[PDB]
């Protein structure tokens, strides 16, 4: 029974091609204007010149779940950004490689 399920893919990005950007992804958060609640953080543009792009090969409009093991699935967009900024850098250069858990919604409208 698999139709409209969402899968979590984990990309591990070493801080090698880092400096060009951190990972080289652009993310943004959106809010449901109807639900008056955040939809979470989604990828908007991949920077083709960053380790996450090179190694991970992630996509646009994917939904960011967790970063370096720390999850943002549950906290608001502005909260999430703080968690990201802090963990992507502070724990990123700490681990040496940064772990990104992103979610893929099985739907045809996906890029």
């Amino acid at each position: 029974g698999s139709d409209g399920t969402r899968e979590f893919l984990t990309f591990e990005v070493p801080l090698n091609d880092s400096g060009s950007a951190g990972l080289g992804v652009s993310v943004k958060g959106n809010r449901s204007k109807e639900n008056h609640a955040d939809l979470g953080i989604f990828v908007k543009s991949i920077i083709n010149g960053g380790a996450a792009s090179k190694d991970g090969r992630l996509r646009v409009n994917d939904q960011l779940i967790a970063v370096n093991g720390e999850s943002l699935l549950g906290k608001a967009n502005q909260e999430a950004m703080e968690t990201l900024r802090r963990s992507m850098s502070t724990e990123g250069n700490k681990r040496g490689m940064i772990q990104l858990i992103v979610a893929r919604r099985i739907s045809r409208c996906n890029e």
């Binding site: 950007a21 951190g22 990972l23 080289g24 992804v25 652009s26 993310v27 943004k28 958060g29 204007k33 953080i41 908007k44 920077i47 996450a52 967009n77 502005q78 950004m81 990201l84 900024r85 992507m88």
Partner: peptide, 16 residues
């Protein structure tokens, strides 16, 4: 060229 989406949002983007 104007009026894209609908809402007072500057699109909160974060680049990693």
């Amino acid at each position: 060229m104007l009026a894209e989406l609908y809402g007072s949002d500057p699109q909160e983007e974060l680049i990693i």
